[PDB]
């Protein structure tokens, strides 16, 4: 299930003041997933039907 | 005389006994490695105390790693109080002359430039200790610098031999073997992380039309003597064109408006021709005597040039 | 100011002064008398952009 | 303004529409603001009457314009071999009536 | 037209040009494959069509502000740029700035670097200016600060550097034990399709040449990541002092003051360029 | 390199915006060929003691993910490529890198071409010309 | 700033001495001068 990627990884120097060509990066959450639950949508208990 | 010598000055302790101190005195033009330029310093920063790193000694590939970051000055008067000493980096003299001394076993030409190494070789690591201060000094050795890029090559290549002979040299007809030693692995993998970078930089797209001239080279050293003595009888292309037979891409992107081998050599003499500075230290010294001669003999004084 | 050349020895020398025009209102005239060459050929050329 | 008389000859408002208004033809080439022919280093001599920087910028003191235009810089070179705009570092002065 | 002697005091570096006429046709050959050769030949035209609104000479402070966006704290880098619109002599030298800056950034895009542009002149220690031109002198050689200034009443001169160019490497790694220090002048590159930055660093350090390559690494290796080469720097002087002093204050250019790191007693050596492809 | 089988350019150079020929032949390539044969030789005992050291290794630690990481698509694809119209007893591979740095090591402080000579002329032009004579300094 | 001068000839003496710069507040104008600096001249 791992997505694919082009590259490994690479180990970069960035200054704080001349940072240039600005970029973003991802945020993960600080518990371990085993918390974070799989999505669950419960269906009403009637329709409208 | 402030922008035209340096004098920095090692001073030196109280309590030392006169045999100790008439060995100071035998050691009029050395070389002493400063960590700053301050013109106050003392011999436990100089002496090999100072040299060692937190709980190990550095073995003599490490030694050299450790001189490239410091400051090599030349004695050039023993007092009896301080130690005069004068940087190579920042300017020599006024008149620029600076006295040196061989303690290799190798004897200069004027216009060597001089290498200094540490005591690699055998029956030769003499270093002066001062038992009165308990202080070691390891006083290197100036080469003419075809050895010293010689000395170095053997190093790097006994180190990546323990990632899984070779200590004998020839330099002037004089048969030289040098200390074979255990290493450090630590520090074998910062020569061997320099080779990689340097190496690869060298690569450009231009260099796949000169590998493609290599059955041209063993074609043609079949005919020359010249070629036929350059090659070796240790060289790997002799090997890798008898198995290889190389081909170009028939046509360049954009090949007509950029040239692609005379970007080739710009980017391999910027990588692979300032190698042999990358793992050793510089050659800032040569040797210019005036009226003695052309040979300045080992132990004896030589006289010294400012070199870039 | 002594400033050694080409093996040679330069001295430059200098006079700082001033200049004031203590008269007010048009204190000289410069009047136009004749005619020497004139310079340009009258010619026809014409001009290319 | 061409909804004005001529200050020269006032019961007209120009010789020519094509070149006195602004965007005329003329002043479509010959004014330095445009910078069309800044190229050629050859000399343009009506550079300075299309070019309106030039009139607006001068003062309108006459005691003044008077001395200056003994001693003005001339736009153009006795050197040249055609002729040429002037090079930025040598400067001539040549009294310009115009 | 691009550098002012008349604006900026007695005491601020200079730098030297190559001849302009030969950036159209280097950018010809130099440039990888997939990139605008024609750009550096109308970059540099509409900039000789912007300073008439031939090795010329840029000074230091003039080439902060074209710079200035591509510097962090920015407050200061945009101080730059406010005295030098309103007092250089030249109309719109903020437009040259704009212009200039665009050179700078096609000279990156097109492979002739600026670092094969730019040499070292002296420090201004008088200049005597004209129409159009100034006849400026300077110290390719020596200490500062006890030259001929041509002034008698003022025989002294100081090296004043703004602080958005100002970097130490001492209080950076804790090196707090003194020395003679040393003065670079460091260029960075960031190669990008059309995102290329400029910045020009005066390193002061105790470091050898030799031992310099590797604190580019460390600080400007964030660069290294996203370009080969990423920085290029030269030699510029020696503090020999065993203390080296620095001084912190803010001199009024005209009417905008700018915090300007002051150097004291520097004594001139210059060097060559160097590449890390 | 090109005689030794040249460009449409390459006999062209500019400086100061004037044009330098350096055709002005026969006699210089067989002048200048013994450099030829030492940087054609160079390089090329050069990229096969890394064609043969990056496939013999290839660390395992962190020399091997910053290596192929940084060679991606600029080595490890020139690797392939090479290796493409090429291929992978002892070889004697470690007693060449001594002979390989000694020579590049030598040629690179012949090509250096190191300045002895720098220009500050005073009270004069700023360019001399040909067959002028210039002030000269080295030292401060 | 200051005339230097007017200090050749001086209206009369400080007789009390302490470490100035802890007062630095109390003064309009003030300076510390190593040794000789070139300004003095």
Same mark, same amino acid.
């Given at each position: ?49 | ?203 450009? !797209? ?49 090949? !007509? ?52 | #100011? ?25 204190? #000289?005239?410069?009047?136009? #008398? ?16 | ?98 | ?70 510097? =962090? ?48 002149? $002296? ?46 490497? =001492? ?7 003194? $020395?003679? &220090? ?32 590797? &604190? ?24 020999? =002092? ?36 | 390199?090109?005689?030794? +089988?040249?460009?449409?350019?390459? +006999? ?129 | ?41």
């Amino acid at each position: 299930m791992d997505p694919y990627y082009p590259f490994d990884a690479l180990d970069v120097w960035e200054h704080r003041r001349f940072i240039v060509a600005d970029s973003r990066s991802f945020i993960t959450p600080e518990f371990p997933r085993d918390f974070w639950m799989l999505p669950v949508f419960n269906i009403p208990r009637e329709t409208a039907a | 005389m402030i922008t035209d010598c340096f004098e920095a000055d090692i001073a030196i302790p109280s309590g030392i006994s006169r045999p100790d101190a008439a060995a100071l005195q035998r050691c009029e033009g050395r070389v002493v490695f400063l960590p700053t330029i301050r013109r106050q310093l003392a011999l436990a920063d100089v002496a090999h105390e100072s040299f060692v790193s937190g709980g190990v000694s550095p073995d003599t590939l490490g030694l050299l790693l450790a001189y490239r970051r410091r400051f090599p000055a030349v004695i050039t008067r023993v007092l009896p109080t301080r130690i005069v000493a004068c940087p190579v980096d920042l300017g020599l003299t006024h008149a620029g002359t600076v006295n040196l001394r061989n303690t290799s076993p190798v004897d200069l030409c004027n216009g060597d430039p001089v290498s200094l190494v540490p005591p690699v070789f055998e029956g030769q690591a003499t270093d002066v200790r001062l038992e009165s201060l308990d202080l070691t000094l390891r006083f290197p050795v100036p080469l003419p610098t075809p050895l010293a890029r010689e000395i170095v090559a053997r190093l790097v290549a006994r180190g990546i031999r323990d990632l899984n002979d070779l200590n004998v040299l020839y330099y002037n007809g004089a048969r030289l073997s040098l200390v074979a030693d255990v290493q450090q692995l630590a520090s074998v993998n910062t020569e061997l992380r320099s080779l990689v970078l340097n190496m690869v930089y060298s690569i450009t !797209e231009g260099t796949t039309l000169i590998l493609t001239l290599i059955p041209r080279l063993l074609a043609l050293s079949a005919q020359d003597g010249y070629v036929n003595a350059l090659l070796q009888m240790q060289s790997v292309t002799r090997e890798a064109a008898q198995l290889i037979h190389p081909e170009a891409p028939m046509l360049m992107q954009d090949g !007509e408006r950029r040239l692609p081998l005379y970007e080739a050599l710009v980017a391999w003499l910027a990588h692979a021709g300032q190698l042999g500075d990358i793992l050793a230290l510089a050659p800032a010294v040569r040797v210019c005597t005036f009226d003695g001669a052309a040979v300045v003999q080992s132990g004896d004084m030589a006289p010294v040039i400012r070199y870039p | #100011a002594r400033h050694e050349t080409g093996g040679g020895v330069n001295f430059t020398l200098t006079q700082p002064r001033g200049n004031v025009d203590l008269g007010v209102g048009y204190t #000289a005239v410069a009047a136009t #008398a004749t005619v020497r060459n004139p310079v340009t050929d009258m010619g026809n050329l014409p001009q290319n952009f | 303004d061409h909804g004005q008389s001529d200050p020269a000859r006032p019961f007209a408002a120009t010789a020519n529409p094509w070149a006195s208004q602004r965007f005329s033809y003329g002043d479509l080439l010959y004014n330095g603001a445009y910078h069309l022919n800044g190229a050629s280093p050859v000399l343009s001599p009506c550079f300075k009457f299309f070019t309106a920087a030039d009139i607006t910028a001068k003062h309108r003191c006459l005691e003044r314009l008077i001395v200056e235009t003994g001693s003005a810089v001339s736009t153009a070179t006795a050197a040249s071999d055609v002729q040429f705009k002037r090079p930025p570092g040598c400067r001539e002065l040549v009294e310009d009536p115009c | 037209d691009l550098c002012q002697p008349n604006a900026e005091r007695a005491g601020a570096l200079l730098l030297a040009l190559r001849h302009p006429t030969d950036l159209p046709h280097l950018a010809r050959h130099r440039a990888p494959p997939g990139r605008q050769t024609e750009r550096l030949a109308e970059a540099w035209g509409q900039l000789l069509e912007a300073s008439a609104l031939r090795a010329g000479l840029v000074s230091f402070n003039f080439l902060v502000a074209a710079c200035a966006a591509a510097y =962090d704290a920015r407050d200061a880098a945009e101080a730059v740029r406010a005295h030098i619109t309103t007092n250089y002599g030249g109309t719109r030298a903020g437009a040259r700035l704009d212009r200039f800056s665009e050179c700078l950034r096609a000279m990156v895009h097109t492979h002739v670097f600026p670092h094969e542009v730019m040499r070292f002149f $002296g420090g201004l220690v008088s200049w005597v200016t004209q129409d159009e031109l100034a006849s400026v002198t300077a110290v390719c050689s020596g200490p500062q600060e006890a030259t001929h200034t041509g002034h008698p009443g003022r025989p002294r001169s100081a090296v004043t550097i703004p602080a958005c160019a100002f970097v130490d490497l =001492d209080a950076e790694l804790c090196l707090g034990g003194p $020395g003679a &220090a040393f003065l670079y002048l460091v260029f960075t590159y960031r190669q990008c399709r059309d995102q290329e930055l400029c910045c020009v660093y005066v390193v002061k350090s105790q470091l050898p040449p030799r031992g310099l390559e590797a &604190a580019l690494e460390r600080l400007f290796g964030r660069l290294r990541i996203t370009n080969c080469t990423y920085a290029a720097f030269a030699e510029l002087g020696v503090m020999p =002092d065993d203390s080296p002093r620095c001084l912190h204050r803010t001199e009024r250019f005209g009417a905008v003051g700018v915090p300007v790191v002051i150097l004291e007693g520097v004594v001139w050596r210059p060097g060559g360029w160097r590449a890390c492809a | 390199i090109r005689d030794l +089988n040249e460009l449409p350019d390459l +006999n062209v150079l500019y400086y100061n915006g004037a044009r330098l020929s350096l055709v002005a032949l026969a006699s210089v390539n067989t002048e200048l060929r013994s450099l030829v044969l030492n940087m054609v030789y160079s390089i090329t005992e050069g990229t096969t003691l890394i064609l043969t050291l990056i496939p013999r290794l290839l660390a395992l630690g962190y020399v091997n993910a910053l290596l192929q990481m940084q060679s991606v698509t600029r080595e490890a694809a020139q690797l392939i490529h090479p290796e493409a119209p090429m291929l992978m007893r002892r070889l004697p591979l470690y007693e060449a890198l001594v002979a390989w740095l000694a020579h590049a090591g030598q040629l690179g402080d012949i090509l250096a071409l190191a300045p002895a000579v720098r220009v500050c002329t005073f009270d004069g032009a700023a360019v001399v010309q040909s067959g002028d004579m210039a002030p000269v300094i080295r030292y401060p | 700033g200051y005339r230097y001068a007017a200090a050749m000839v001086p209206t009369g003496s400080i007789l009390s001495t302490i470490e100035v710069a802890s007062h630095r507040r109390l003064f309009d104008f003030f300076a510390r001068v190593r040794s000789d600096e070139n300004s003095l001249y």
